[PDB]
Amino acid sequence: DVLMTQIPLSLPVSLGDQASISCRSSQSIVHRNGNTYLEWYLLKPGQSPKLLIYKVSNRFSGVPDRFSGSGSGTDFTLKISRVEAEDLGVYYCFQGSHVPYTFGGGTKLEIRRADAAPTVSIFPPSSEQLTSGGASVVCFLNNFYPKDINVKWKIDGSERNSWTDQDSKDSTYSMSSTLTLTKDEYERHNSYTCEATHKTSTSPIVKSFN
């Protein structure tokens, strides 16, 4: 099989800068008919793959002209000039010359923006869930950068997670932390605390509820 090696694994880039992704095949991908069926696809979060480039260097209809492809034989490059926030996601090269057709490992393009402190919110169990017989306290940490963040759950002072992809609008991250416990254990405590420690602020961002 033709192995497609993609570099880099992760590509952080500031808005307006250029970006380059490389793809190297373990053997030539020149078809018998003389064509090189090397394609580039973009997988945006929650969407089906999108064709960007076909036959090494040909831009697919509707693709912005800031995308370009080049290369030959075994070495190929996807170039993005003046990166925009809508460009984030996972880029794949693909060879369609030799069966079995094979994809590269993927490159996750991430937008590098200014550091942003998360907006923290805490939510008690609703009435309906309480009737059911469980108790979930929900904490949203929305619109922060960069992705790394710490969350701590404390019940009455004593200690006790889902990450979104990067947002295509403002290049921020969001995270949800859900503390699940029994209704009986929930009824016998008072204060519930969700602490958010981020690279932005020195002091933790605490949100509690009675």
Partner: protein, 210 residues
């Protein structure tokens, strides 16, 4: 209007078979080949095979040929992928895509296959209520993936953050949030709409101010 319509979610038992469909419309079905691509969380994209509806020829990735059969019915413009001898390793999102001249230009929406003996369980949908105000709904205790969430039947799209599901005790839990201006809620009603295709269930939860 070229469209490849799949089905969002299939659940199948270990050792059984499943036959997934890709209904093409908007073009001459026999003139393009239909390919199948597998996306398993930690394995990139994998090409499964293609079927040429004009000739009837199906080409297979030899790694899956003993568990895969591709067919096409021109009279209904539908391509099919049948997987046999299913294992948990086969759980993944599967796409169909058409191609002829410029690679994979149109793609199906993807079909999430889960291989498990567990029963289908619809989610419980709970409202999450408290300048800018964040609301949400908690989609708890469902199986299998996926669920889709909109707000106000899709009319409320800006300011939404839907979080990936977490698996605990063999059930999935997801949360979605929407941030709104205070002057509109609860004057203008806000409803979270949840769909669980595997159980064919839809739930509309109004977020009451209390």
């Amino acid at each position: 209007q070229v469209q490849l319509q799949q089905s969002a979610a299939e659940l199948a038992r270990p050792g059984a078979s499943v036959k997934m469909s890709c209904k093409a419309s908007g073009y001459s079905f026999t003139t393009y080949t239909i390919h199948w691509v597998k996306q398993r969380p930690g394995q990139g994209l994998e090409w499964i095979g293609y079927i040429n509806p004009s000739s009837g020829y199906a080409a297979y990735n030899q790694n899956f040929k003993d568990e895969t059969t591709l067919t096409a019915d021109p009279s209904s413009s539908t391509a099919y992928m049948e997987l046999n001898s299913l294992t948990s390793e086969d759980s993944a999102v599967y796409y169909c895509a058409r191609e002829k001249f410029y690679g994979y230009d149109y793609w199906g929406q993807g079909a999430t296959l889960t291989v498990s003996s567990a029963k289908t369980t619809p989610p419980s949908v709970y409202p999450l209520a408290p300048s800018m105000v964040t609301l949400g709904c908690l989609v708890k205790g469902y199986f299998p993936e996926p669920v889709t969430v909109t707000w106000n039947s899709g009319s409320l799209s800006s300011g939404v953050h839907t979080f990936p599901a977490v698996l605990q005790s063999d059930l999935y839990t997801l949360s979605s949030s929407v941030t709104v201006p205070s002057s509109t809620w609860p004057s203008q009603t806000v409803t979270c709409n949840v769909a669980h295709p595997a159980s064919s269930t839809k739930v509309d939860k109004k977020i009451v101010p209390r």
